[PDB]
Amino acid sequence: EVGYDDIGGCRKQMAQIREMVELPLRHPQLFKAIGIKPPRGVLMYGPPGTGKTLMARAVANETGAFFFLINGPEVMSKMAGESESNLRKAFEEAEKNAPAIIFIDEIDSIAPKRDKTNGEVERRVVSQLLTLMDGMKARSNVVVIAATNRPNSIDPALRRFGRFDREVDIGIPDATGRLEVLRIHTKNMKLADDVDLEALAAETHGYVGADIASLCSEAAMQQIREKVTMDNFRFALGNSNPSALRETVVESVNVTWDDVGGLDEIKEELKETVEYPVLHPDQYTKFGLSPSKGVLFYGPPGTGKTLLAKAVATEVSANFISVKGPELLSMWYGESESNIRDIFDKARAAAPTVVFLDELDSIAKARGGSLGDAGGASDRVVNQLLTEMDGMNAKKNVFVIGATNRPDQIDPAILRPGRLDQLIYVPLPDENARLSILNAQ
């Protein structure tokens, strides 16, 4: 069995569960004559790549409690009588073998919000999860952990002090958090001396944590196919298909490494702005000032504009998210504004990262009246991305790369100098810049 060493990285979040289950049962004499009991429920939210079933078994095996997993959509049936007692018999089963962990997963179809009022079996399973957990027994034996991929779709009336009222955050593992992940999965079937594990962690940028655990089992299949080395992990890196680049595929995929750029007088400036806070984090805290956030390129189109977008992302250890110009702006009314909303919180959850904005003139018009060049005149999509740059939130390490053709429609509202830092202009390449670009191709 495995306990408290299954994943590295996010272990202060697992230590919060360690002081929630084990610490009551290790010293129960400290929790009598203290008054108020600890809470009895944790809602673990985040991307559903990690699964959370591998962390909940690490906690339950260390304390010795029972692990009785109940899947999400299996308690819902179309006969409408056993759906409210398949969950009720689970807590009746976990009452005998105290202590025990229930660990209900995928709370989207089960226990939804009653704002829609659609379906009688969906409105009663909220109340069945309601009506028992208030009278659920104390002293930390029938505790429940929740695994849900969206924390804003469950019922807000569910959380009254005792159902799920200890919120914890699980996001994308950062640098020096994915290194301890591959240390666990390579404890058996040891790699040779040629492959380095620290260079392996620089290749993974924004992976879900369980994807690089399956990357080790994929690269080990290449060694039995050869009959593990550095080239076996390199071939399994491109075939892993992470969630950041899963939704878009353009055949065939290209990954370049022999591009450094012939524009060297701005390459040291681009290393100064977005590459120095992600390499030297402690110096910006000892000076007490925020680092550089964004930059904008403008000039002639096709003159190394997209080449600067991919040469920077290959040199930084962060992932690359690219918008396709006027492709996220649909004719439908509402989700055209939401297409800016879902690409920035994904960038903030994958901090640090670099986003690329291209052909700014087709979306902005810079305020222009209530009139439009095509006729839609939707001034709310420019005000939405006006709010997503600074916001009222934590200052993340997100970087934005602006690219446009003509600086006439440049928007003076997107240009406050805290938003974009440098208004640099790219010229046509000269004769000395042309010799540095022919040998690189």
Partner 1 sequence: LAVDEELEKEDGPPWDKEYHEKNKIKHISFHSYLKKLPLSEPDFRINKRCHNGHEPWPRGICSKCQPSAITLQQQEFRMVDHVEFQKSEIINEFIQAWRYTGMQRFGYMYGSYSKYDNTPLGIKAVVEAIYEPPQHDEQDGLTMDVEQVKNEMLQIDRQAQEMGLSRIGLIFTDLSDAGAGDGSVFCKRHKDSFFLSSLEVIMAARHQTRHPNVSKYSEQGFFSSKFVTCVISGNLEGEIDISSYQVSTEAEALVTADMISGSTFPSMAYINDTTDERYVPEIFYMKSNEYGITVKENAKPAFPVDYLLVTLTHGFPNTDTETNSKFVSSTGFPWSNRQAMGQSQDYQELKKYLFNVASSGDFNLLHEKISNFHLLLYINSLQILSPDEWKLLIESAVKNEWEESLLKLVSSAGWQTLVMILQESG
Binding site feature residues: 48-54, 149, 185, 302-307
Contacts of range 335-343, beta carbons closer than 8 Å, 24 or more positions apart: 336/378, 336/381, 337/378, 337/380, 337/381, 337/384, 340/381, 340/384, 340/385, 340/388, 341/384, 341/388
> Which amino acid belongs to residue 415?
L
Give the residue among 307, 318, 302, 296 at the shortest CA–CA distance from 262: 307
Tell whether residue 90 is a contact of a copy of itself (CB under 8 A).
Answer: no
Q: Which residue has the tokens 């080395």?
A: 229
**Which CB sits closer to a copy of itself, 120 or 268?**
120
Q: Does 50 bind ligand ADP (CB under 6 A)?
A: yes
Q: Annotated binding residues for ATP, as ranges?
A: 48-54, 149, 185, 302-307
Binding of residue 417 to ligand ADP (CB under 6 A): no
How far apart CA 34 and CA 133 sit, in angstroms, is 22
Stretch that binds ligand ADP, among 215-223, 241-249, 304-312, 327-335 (CB under 6 A): 304-312
d(CA 88, CA 129): 8
**The one among 4, 6, 90, 271 contacting ligand ADP by CB under 6 A:** 6
Pick the binder of partner 1 from 26, 30, 37, 95 (CB under 8 A). Answer: 95
Q: Which residues contact 275 (CB under 8 A, 6 or more apart)?
A: 315, 316
* Residues 49-78: x where in contact with ligand BEF by CB under 6 A, - otherwise, as a string: ---xx-------------------------
Distance CA 130, CA 184 (A): 39
- Omega prior to 252 cis, within 30 of 0: yes
Q: How far is the CB of 52 from partner 1 (least distance, A)?
A: 13
CB 113 within 8 A of CB 76: no
Min CB(123)–partner 1 separation in Å: 19
Alpha helices in 256-315 (DSSP H): 264-273, 281-287, 305-315
Segment 133 to 172, residues that bind a copy of itself, using CB under 8 A: 134, 149-150, 153, 156-161
Residue 299's contacts (CB-CB under 8 Å, 6 or more residues apart) are: 425, 426, 427, 428
Among residues 307 and 389, whose Cβ is nearest to ligand ADP?
307
- In this chain, which of 304, 322, 352, 381 binds ligand ADP, going by CB under 6 A? 304
> Shortest distance, CB of residue 104 to partner 1, whole angstroms?
11
Return the residue of 39, 49, 407, 429 that touches a copy of itself, per CB under 8 A.
Answer: 49
Distance CA(283)–CA(276), nearest Å, equals 9
Closest C-alpha among 169, 146, 157, 143 to residue 40: 143
Query: Which position among 23, 38, 61, 384 is part of the footprint of partner 1 (CB under 8 A)?
Result: 61
- Check if the beta carbon of residue 223 is closer than 8 Å to that of residue 261: no
Chain positions contacting partner 1, by CB under 8 A = 1-2, 53-54, 57, 60-61, 66-71, 74-75, 86, 88-92, 95-96, 132, 134-137
Applying CB under 6 A, the residues found at the interface with ligand BEF are 48, 52-53, 105, 130, 134, 147, 160
Instruction: Summarize as ranges the residues that interact with ligand ADP (CB under 6 A).
Output: 6-7, 9-10, 48-54, 134, 147, 160-161, 173, 181, 185, 209-210, 213, 301-307, 429, 434, 437
